[PDB]
Design a protein around this nucleic acid. Sequence first.
DNA 1: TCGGCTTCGCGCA
DNA 2: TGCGCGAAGCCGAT
Length: 456
Amino acid sequence: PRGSHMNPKRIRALKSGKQGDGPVVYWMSRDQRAEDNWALLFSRAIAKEANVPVVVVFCLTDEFLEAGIRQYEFMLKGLQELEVSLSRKKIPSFFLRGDPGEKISRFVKDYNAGTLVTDFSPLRIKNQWIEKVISGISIPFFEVDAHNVVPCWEASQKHEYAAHTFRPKLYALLPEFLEEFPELEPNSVTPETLSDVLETGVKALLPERALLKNKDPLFEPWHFEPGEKAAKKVMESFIADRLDSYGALRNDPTKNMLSNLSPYLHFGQISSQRVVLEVEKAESNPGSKKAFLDEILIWKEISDNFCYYNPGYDGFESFPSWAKESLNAHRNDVRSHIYTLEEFEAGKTHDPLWNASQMELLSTGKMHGYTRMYWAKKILEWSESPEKALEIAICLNDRYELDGRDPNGYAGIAWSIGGVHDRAWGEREVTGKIRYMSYEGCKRKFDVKLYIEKYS
DNA sequence: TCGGCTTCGCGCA
DNA sequence: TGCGCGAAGCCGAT
Ligand SMILES: Cc1cc2nc3c(=O)[nH]c(=O)nc-3n(C[C@H](O)[C@H](O)[C@H](O)COP(=O)(O)OP(=O)(O)OC[C@H]3O[C@@H](n4cnc5c(N)ncnc54)[C@H](O)[C@@H]3O)c2cc1C
């Protein structure tokens, strides 16, 4: 569909039909940004070919009642900034509330849209809304992978067992798909308040806030400023100040040496392709660059591959056969400790390291990358069953992580609990052959006491 | 039918 | 601290 700097492999047709005479509508769900957005760029070019304006629509669903205020404010503040950025390019933004299967279909008929475009997400609920929209529209419907450097349907046609199988396929396609982003051309043709939605949502989630003993909320919202502009600053400071030491200190939670890009990446407020562009371009430690690129290319996009080809990505069924057989045989093993969801949530276990990790999660909304494994694996060790462990880890992850409700989270938990994209290890009690992590193992890798003292 | 697996623990300089 | 081995099942190159 036209374009010179436009790889057609990034766009797939969800529904064919006659192209209407109205504006092209970009249904934005996952990539909430104005710059470095292939889905937004693809909508602009098609609208340019038909001599029609492009508009962006966002549907606020009821799914924010399952998470907390920390994610709601972070997303809403970014949308307010994105609304002004799109208005400067004469691109109006419409914010709907309700079921997208009904609101998008009503919007497309009322505004007489000619072409519908949306970004890609392998999550189950996104596919359900797509199927409802297809059944309610008669105009072409397109889907664009704006989140991965290589389109998810292009990197692999099947579920990938391990990184070492998926790595050569991704890197082989890098010279074709790693490219600079063209500038978003403003519209040539012009034709609910987010403040009220922010106020209404906060009041609804206020009773379910995470409070302390003296009725003070735990969340500290000054650690990550939301928005597309603030995402850019985080990327710059990582390359200038932290990228050099990333390879050596990525597994040290006492050192702030991570990129801290996961909140922005999850909400689409910054493009991982843009980050990869800047990282590939910087002169830094070759070991550190390879260590970071593997996280943001291999492990990030293989989490999409996992969720896209495994509809039960959040269930015990998706675990590899050796893992399911191992965990099943140890179901009757006596657990040293058994904690409920409430006890896990409040950090009331016998392990100060686990409790400290939970307190980082509650107070900052971003647990360090290394402790997230120890956190999830100890949940498996101190729960009734593998099923109860999975649901507890998923519940706590999505409720308190800024980057939660994400394919990285589900693949990250499946790695820790079911050994997905992992291999078998020493046979043990309760965890079977799943990779084991111990408190003493953390002690020899970083100052555990400093991490504990930082979070009580 | 071998080689080597994100990210393990553990003994040893 | 950094290094090498152990423990374990399997994909993918042939
Ligand atoms: C049990 C568990 C749960 C997790 N929960 C989430 C989650 O809810 N959401 C989320 O985005 N990630 C999650 N992670 C993956 C990873 O820990 C985070 O991406 C990382 O901690 C975010 O911090 P960072 O961006 O500063 O890390 P960096 O080291 O700077 O990572 C750079 C980027 O690479 C990607 N990445 C890094 N590590 C991984 C990984 N292990 N798997 C996949 N992609 C990765 C992310 O996009 C990340 O932003 C989880 C991992 C585990 C083991």
